[PDB]
Design a binder for this molecule. Structure first.
Ligand SMILES: OC[C@@]1(O)OC[C@@H](O)[C@@H](O)[C@@H]1O
Ligand SMILES: OC[C@@]1(O)OC[C@@H](O)[C@@H](O)[C@@H]1O
Ligand SMILES: OC[C@H]1O[C@](O)(CO)[C@@H](O)[C@@H]1O
Ligand SMILES: [Mg+2]
Ligand SMILES: [Mg+2]
Length: 477
């Protein structure tokens, strides 16, 4: 049982060169806290860190749309806003009746919007959450203009966030992606990912919500290979998922966290003793060269920070990363800064299959707490970093959502893209429950966030499961 790396939570200047590490000694706490499942149970995780089992008879959010990563209409304070008595969400969408299969939908993603009347308790809405699909948010061909005349086979609109803020009242921060792939899915040139902004206008009457504008897409950030990995450094790089927010500690600034990778050429032997996170006199420390030899150098997640450099928020620059998972996991996705009781919670999603050799954990949401947006972040829950995982046996193989291992929990991929909302409510989408694939919103759940630890509230809704796609507004716009 490894000694977890201690962390102070101390704050730094957002502009200073300090990056917190989610170390191997921290991440190894997840398996240390786990138990061999007592058959026929197939969950190894601590109950307080486990998402309840989602029913196999879940409804689709819409019969004509695969929905996955979802975000609310929000402000830069993380408030979720209603507009003229309507709740509004935005999702990555694809067409289930378009010829491509669920696992191939990502390069076809379009941002869509849904709406429903505000102020109805979840259990009084239709079981599907009563979301009305408005269609695509952006005009056809508007997003792809950010790439100009580059060779391309597909473009997609990937995740970010919506900010209620010209006649325009909504800024959509998102990830424009361009692919140049052979028919087998191999990259002819590396994918291009540009964090972008498009402004438009939400309008409503008693019947429907609709949007105008989003004709002009502004490229804000693309990786430069100093702090954030490029496609030239690694064709499989990640760079996406802007969360734009105001830090009360730095009024007058607007910040953004996003997913990146550490800026190394792929296959570099770049991990350090600080990524491993052992005392040099710990007789049970791992060996740095052994860890890199095991292939852990292919797992290089980071959480980036950027700051606006003009009043209009149309110019941005990179700051050093706030969290790295080098030789731990390749993915720290959809990061968000969640403010509670003067503390800064960094929540980010990750996958079991993108852990480095010698480290393991479930698909779900990971959490860290500190005294600022740039902190020596304290991994939650016994210095582990796990906030909430799908039920998973860490003592048997992971499998995949398209090929479940029958020795593994059939709900290990039941949900993904957990987004933490005001009051600790968590929304997500359904990926696989046994042989059924979702592309529908999951039941909303509730975590009790208490200092350095969290507990899934098993009294919320029906034995921990709230409404399908319950993404409520707390404040009128
Ligand atoms: O040792 C680091 C530290 O304490 O140094 C003084 C200031 O720069 C602080 O922001 C910072 O946390
Ligand atoms: O992997 C080595 C390291 O120096 O790379 C740059 C940053 O990610 C740091 O946090 C990290 O410790
Ligand atoms: O859906 C497109 C991509 O964006 C994410 O959903 C969140 O970062 C990834 O899991 C996926 O690869
Ligand atoms: Mg593994
Ligand atoms: Mg078995």
């Amino acid at each position: 049982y490894p000694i977890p790396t201690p962390h102070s939570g101390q704050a730094y200047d957002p502009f200073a060169d300090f990056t917190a590490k989610w170390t191997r000694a921290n991440a190894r706490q997840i398996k240390a806290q786990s138990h061999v499942p007592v058959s026929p149970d197939q969950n190894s995780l601590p109950l307080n860190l486990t998402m309840p089992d989602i029913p196999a008879d879940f409804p689709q959010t819409n019969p004509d749309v695969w929905v996955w990563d979802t975000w609310p209409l929000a402000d830069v304070h993380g408030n979720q806003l209603s507009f003229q008595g309507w709740e509004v969400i935005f999702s990555l969408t694809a067409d289930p009746h378009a010829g491509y299969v669920f696992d191939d939908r990502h390069v076809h993603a379009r941002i869509g919007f849904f709406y429903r009347k505000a102020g109805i308790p979840a259990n009084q809405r239709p079981i599907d959450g009563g979301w009305i699909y408005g269609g695509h948010l952006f005009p056809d061909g508007s997003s792809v203009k950010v790439f100009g005349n580059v060779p391309m086979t597909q473009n997609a609109e990937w995740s970010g966030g919506a900010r209620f803020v010209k006649n325009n009242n909504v800024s959509l921060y998102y990830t424009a992606t361009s692919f140049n792939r052979n028919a087998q899915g191999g990259n002819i040139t590396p994918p291009i990912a540009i964090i972008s902004r498009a402004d438009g206008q939400i309008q409503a009457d008693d019947k429907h919500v609709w949007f105008t504008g989003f004709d002009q897409h502004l490229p804000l950030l693309a990786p430069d290979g100093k702090y954030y990995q490029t496609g030239q450094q690694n064709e499989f790089f990640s760079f996406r998922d802007p969360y734009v927010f105001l830090d009360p500690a730095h009024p007058g600034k607007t910040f953004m966290v996003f997913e990146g990778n550490t800026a190394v050429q792929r296959g570099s032997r770049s991990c350090t003793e600080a990524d491993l996170g052992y005392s040099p006199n710990d007789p049970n420390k791992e060996d740095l060269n052994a860890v890199m030899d095991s292939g852990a150098i292919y797992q290089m997640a980071n959480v980036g920070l950027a700051v606006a450099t003009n009043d209009e928020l149309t110019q941005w620059k990179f700051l050093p990363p706030i969290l790295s998972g080098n030789c731990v996991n390749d993915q720290t996705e959809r990061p968000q800064i969640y403010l509670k009781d003067g503390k800064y919670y960094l929540f980010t999603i990750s996958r079991r299959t993108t852990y480095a050799a010698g480290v393991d954990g479930p698909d779900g949401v990971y959490g860290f707490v500190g005294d600022g947006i740039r902190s020596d972040f304290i991994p939650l829950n016994g210095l582990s970093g796990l906030t909430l995982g799908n039920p998973t046996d860490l003592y048997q193989p992971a499998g995949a959502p398209y090929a479940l291992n029958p020795n593994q929990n059939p709900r290990t991929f039941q949900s993904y893209s957990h987004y933490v909302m005001p009051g600790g409510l968590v929304e997500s989408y359904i990926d696989a429950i046994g042989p059924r694939r979702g592309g529908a919103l999951a039941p909303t759940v509730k975590i009790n966030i208490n200092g350095t630890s969290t507990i899934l509230d098993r009294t919320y809704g029906n034995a921990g499961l709230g409404g399908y796609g319950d993404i409520p507004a707390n404040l009128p716009a």
